[PDB]
Amino acid sequence: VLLKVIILGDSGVGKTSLMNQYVNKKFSNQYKATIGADFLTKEVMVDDRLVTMQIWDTAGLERFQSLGVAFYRGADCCVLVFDVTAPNTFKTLDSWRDEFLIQASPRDPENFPFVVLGNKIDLENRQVATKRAQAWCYSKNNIPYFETSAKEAINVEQAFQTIARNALKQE
Amino acid sequence: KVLLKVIILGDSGVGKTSLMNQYVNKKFSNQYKATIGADFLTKEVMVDDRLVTMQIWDTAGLERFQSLGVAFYRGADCCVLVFDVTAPNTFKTLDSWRDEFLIQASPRDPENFPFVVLGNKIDLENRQVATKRAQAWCYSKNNIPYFETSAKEAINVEQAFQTIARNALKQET
Amino acid sequence: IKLVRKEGGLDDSVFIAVKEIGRDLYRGLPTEERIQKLEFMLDKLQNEIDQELEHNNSLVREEKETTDTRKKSLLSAALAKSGERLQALTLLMIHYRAGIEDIETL
Ligand SMILES: Nc1nc2c(ncn2[C@@H]2O[C@H](COP(=O)(O)OP(=O)(O)OP(=O)(O)O)[C@@H](O)[C@H]2O)c(=O)[nH]1
Ligand SMILES: Nc1nc2c(ncn2[C@@H]2O[C@H](COP(=O)(O)OP(=O)(O)OP(=O)(O)O)[C@@H](O)[C@H]2O)c(=O)[nH]1
Ligand SMILES: [Mg+2]
Ligand SMILES: [Mg+2]
């Protein structure tokens, strides 16, 4: 029983930092752009059983994307990340979610498992408010919403525990 | 400063690693050090007046099981096909190496993509693949150049890679 | 930004394969020398990625600022080829990373 989770969202929002904080318990300040994709593996406990979670990090920058359509068809759960200090990254969430649904073409697209992370809450002068993001998540079939900091490991463990539960729904 | 990416292909043991090391490092190992580990070396070369950077990729290892050409061949400007003139079976597989590259790299104009064929180990003074034979195969493959080489004695090594550089440069923007 | 659709893009199997093979990279060498050679390769690969990524960014800046359609079309093809080289280099780095991860699971 293997769970395939993919992380999507604009470049710079913290997709790689969130994956590395959850699996490796480490965080780095310096930016290394993700080219193409990579995955890490983690055993996670759901209910009292170990399932293997395969967490796919992907390129936010369009010119560095290389994954084919067949790849997205096997995703069990899709994580949407934005930056609470960068409202354009919240604005584009619709196009990430919709384009993924077109390529994944799940059998019941409107109940596909998404989880949304609002990252970098450790920064001052956040420009997207919690209720505003919550309103959006509610409107999209009430998908779970976590506010996270990869830099300070706020809600990282809690978010991925929900991601794993949602991925099992599909599987 | 133009960068030229060169893939070297061919059966285990023909001298791929040794041809790269002899061109780039001017060193040869008599010892058989089989390629564990894809790697590339870099060398500045002058092509008629232009100074260009050549990256020479040595991706193949013990057995072909690796689909790793899908990962590593992309972006190449030239592909070097190497066989051992003392082992006719290494010449027999050239078609499959050339086709492998064309399928897994998907170059923009497959029929004009620069290939170069090196028949290696002429110093072993045992020639089981005749010079005319390799040239006939090469001619039929859209007229690609053929060089007989020795990585051990540095025979034709500098000459082969100068032509590799030129032909890699020729098909670009 | 958006999710590019690429009909023959990469599949699971390529990443799984580079990791499976990479796990045994330089197996045979002493546990001392093995981790030496792997660190050397990851450092060399990062420097090469950095270099290429700086050339890539320079091509991006210049394509944004060009009005001449001919020179834009040439910049786009160079940027595409830079992108392909970066994909290969990144998959090579992932290959050697699996060697490191093999040492530290042991
Ligand atoms: N302050 C703060 N910085 C973060 C946080 N998460 C990531 N960063 C930093 O933000 C920058 C971008 O982070 P990445 O994880 O590389 O972003 P990415 O989403 O993977 O970007 P791409 O690979 O281009 O798609 C890096 O410099 C990180 O150090 C966070 O929660 N708080
Ligand atoms: N006599 C002679 N021996 C050579 C020559 N070139 C390579 N060799 C020897 O042939 C053997 C194979 O050399 P490699 O360079 O590792 O061959 P390779 O094509 O990279 O293939 P793998 O070893 O399987 O990775 C080694 O013992 C070399 O010393 C040559 O030009 N003349
Ligand atoms: Mg990233
Ligand atoms: Mg070799």
Numbering used by the authors:
A (entry chain A): 7 to 177
B (entry chain B): 6 to 178
C (entry chain C): 999 to 1104
Lines quoted from the article behind this entry:
PDZD8 is an ER anchored lipid transfer protein containing a lipid-binding module of the synaptotagmin-like mitochondrial-lipid-binding (SMP) domain family. PDZD8 consists of an N-terminal transmembrane helix, a SMP domain, a PDZ domain, a C1 domain, and the C-terminal coiled-coil domain. PDZD8 tethers the ER to late endosomes and lysosomes by associating its C-terminal coiled-coil (CC) with the LE Rab7. The GTP-loaded Rab7A (hereafter referred to as Rab7) on the LEs recruits various effectors facilitating endosome transport along microtubule tracks and their fusion with lysosomes and autophagosomes.
The structure of the PDZD8 CC–Rab7 complex was determined at 2.1 Å resolution by molecular replacement method using a structure of the GTP-bound Rab7. In the asymmetric unit of the crystal, there were two molecules of Rab7 bound to a single molecule of the PDZD8 CC. The PDZD8 CC forms a coiled-coil structure within a single polypeptide chain and does not have intermolecular coiled-coil interaction. The three α-helices form a flat structure arranged in an α1-α3-α2 topology. Two Rab7 molecules (Rab7a-A and Rab7a-B) bind on the opposite sides of the flat CC structure and have no direct contact with each other. Two Rab7 molecules loaded with GTP have an active closed conformation of switch I and II loops. The direct recognition of the PDZD8 CC on the closed conformation of switch loops explains the GTP-dependent interaction of PDZD8 and Rab7. The MBP-PDZD8 CC bound two GTP-loaded Rab7 molecules with Kd values of 0.67 and 11.1 μM, respectively. The asymmetric bivalent binding of Rab7 and the membrane anchoring by Rab7 impose a constraint in the orientation of the PDZD8 CC–Rab7 complex, positioning the coiled-coil domain parallel to the membrane surface.
